[PDB]
Structure 1
Amino acid sequence: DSLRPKLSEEQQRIIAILLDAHHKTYDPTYSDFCQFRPPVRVNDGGSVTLELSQLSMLPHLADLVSYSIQKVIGFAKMIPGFRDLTSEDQIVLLKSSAIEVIMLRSNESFTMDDMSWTCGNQDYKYRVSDVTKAGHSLELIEPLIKFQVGLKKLNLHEEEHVLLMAICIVSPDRPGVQDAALIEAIQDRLSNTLQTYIRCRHPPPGSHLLYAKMIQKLADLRSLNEEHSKQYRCLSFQPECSMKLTPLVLEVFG
């Protein structure tokens, strides 16, 4: 049964644009990371009290996330149709999706070799213990690692990866959007591109229900987003926390 319509010229153009956008905004050598405030790892083999007292990994990770938010803003601006949205809707979509797109894009550095995000030598290898040294708890971290492994195991083509990040950003069901119908039309154009790509271009057996597995990952991201936000709120009560973050991070997550 399953018909396999060919990608339209327009859909091929969308894919080309998104790939180019990603290649321009995601440096796979991590060569800027030496510009961030340095990673510091206090001895904490056991402690929430110590973690909050020092927040040793927070300046480095806040700089990494802040940099990544900048990159995602750039990426978003290149999504076909995004600039047709009002400025207010653009900003609502970016602020609401930022953490989720950071989680998706990080999958590229994530490695199942040792369940880390590996971005160079030891200094820029991030493990669960680094995230706890930035003031988060295992209610966020363990589902985050489970999410990274589940995504890695879909073995997405880069085309599918960039479409998934675009679909995440252009979501009509974010609080505070004004033109939900326009956002939905943009998202549907991207979703249709993805569905078509998978059916034409993704060999079996990895194509089996791949679209539905990808839409499930979007739902998973909502849950992580909510948990991150709850934890960020608590982290923000720590005196002097603001100096360890950045203005962009404070705005997006405040």
Structure 2
Amino acid sequence: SLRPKLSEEQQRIIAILLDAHHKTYDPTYSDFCQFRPPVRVNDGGGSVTLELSQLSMLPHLADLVSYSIQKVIGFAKMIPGFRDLTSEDQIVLLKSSAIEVIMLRSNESFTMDDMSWTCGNQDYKYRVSDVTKAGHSLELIEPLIKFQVGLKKLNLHEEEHVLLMAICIVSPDRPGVQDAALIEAIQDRLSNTLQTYIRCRHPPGSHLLYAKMIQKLADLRSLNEEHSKQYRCLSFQPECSMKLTPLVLEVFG
């Protein structure tokens, strides 16, 4: 019902988050030529044995994810209040939310035209098949694609998008957090900002949108769990560590 205006502090938070995102997410994907090249081995049958023996797309996707994790760390450090947390809690939040933020931010390159993540040209277009060539199964990829479409259909403003990622990162319910109270205070400030933005930018479905956005955070926890399970299996493959990166190994190890 009530549609209060954004306070000066809330306007600053949003401006800060938009700027942080613009500085950490390159919409031209110009750094992709620096990643190990993608390699697509003939695997129309989706052979688990073949995929594991080759892991042809893993070096490229691992570099992409590693690169993205570095960008997410940068984005997080710019979130108002994040610096107020102990170094220990910052690392805990980053490691636990990393894959979720990547899934969220990837929605920008995701396109419903052909259900793929398109980053410039055809060499950097990723479909279900490309992800299976990295060692993952449909048990993760299919729900991920469904998640991307659902997120796409929310038609989030960039403001809502960056606030959602910030809220995802600053979650007090991450195992291992020490000062959950402080984290919750920061998250509440971000959540209140999002709720307020939605209300004065969306007429009362403002309430339906916020609820739908919060539901996405829950969906991400499940995707996070499945990814962790699959990463474990992948780690068992001999010589897999060389196809990953030090950052990836530590974050998901």
- Shorter-chain TM range is over 0.9
Q: Counterpart of 2:26 in 1: which secondary structure?
A: coil
Alignment match, 1:34: 33
Q: Go from structure 1 to structure 2 and tell me whether the alpha carbon gap of 1:46 and 1:225 turns closer, same or farther (over 3 Å shift).
A: closer
The answer to whether the 8 Å contact 2:46/2:132 transfers is: no
- Deviation per CA, 1:147-188: give whole Å up to 9, x if none: 000000000000000000000000000010000000000000
State the alpha-carbon separation in 1 of the partners of residues 207 and 31 from structure 2.
Answer: 38
Structure 1 residue matching 2:207: 3-state secondary structure: coil
TM-score by length of 2: 0.98
**Aligned residue in 1 for 2:140:** 140
Summarize the Cα distance change of 1:46–1:245 in structure 2 as closer, same or farther, 3 Å threshold.
closer
SS at match of 2:135: coil
Q: What is the RMSD of the two structures over their aligned residues, measured on CA atoms?
A: 0.9
Offset, 1:205 = 8.0
Check conservation: 2:69, 2:102, Cα contact below 8 A. Answer: yes
User: How big is the shift at 1:201?
Assistant: 1.1
TM-score (norm 1): 0.98
Deviation at 1:77, TM superposition (A): 0.3
Change (3 A) 1:46 1:246: closer
Please identify runs of 4+ aligned residues in structure 1 that moved more than 2 A. Answer: 204-208
- Asked whether the 8 Å contact 1:38–1:59 carries over to 2, the reply is yes
Asked whether the equivalents of residues 66 and 248 of structure 2 are also in contact (C-alpha less than 8 Å), the reply is yes
- The change in CA–CA distance for 1:14 and 1:39 in structure 2 (over 3 A counts) is same
Asked if structure 2 preserves the Cα contact closer than 8 Å seen for 1:57 and 1:130, the reply is yes
Deviation at 1:98, TM superposition (A): 0.1
Distance 2:232 2:155 in 1: 34
Check conservation: 2:40, 2:56, Cα contact below 8 A.
yes
Q: CA deviation at 1:206?
A: 5.2
**How many residues align structurally?**
252
Aligned to 1:63: 63
Consecutive unaligned residues of structure 2, counting only runs of 5 or more, are none
| SS of equivalent to 1:155 | coil
Q: Percent sequence identity over matched residues?
A: 100
Alignment of 1:75-114 (within 5 A): 75-114=75-114
Deviation string 1:39-93 (CA, Å, 9 cap, x unpaired) is 0000004400000000000000000000000000000000000000000000000
Q: Any residues of structure 2 matched to 1:231-246 within 5 Å, and which?
A: 231-246=230-245
Contact 1:154–1:206 under 8 Å retained in 2 = no
For residues 205 and 106 of structure 1, the distance between their equivalents in structure 2, rounded to whole angstroms, comes to 29
- Please report how far the alpha carbon of residue 207 of structure 1 lies from its aligned counterpart in structure 2 after TM superposition: 3.4
CA distance in 1, matches of 2:107, 2:204: 22
Q: CA deviation at 1:208?
A: 5.1
In 1, Cα distance between equivalents of 2:17 and 2:200: 18
Say if 2:46 and 2:129, in contact at 8 Å, map to a contact too. Answer: no
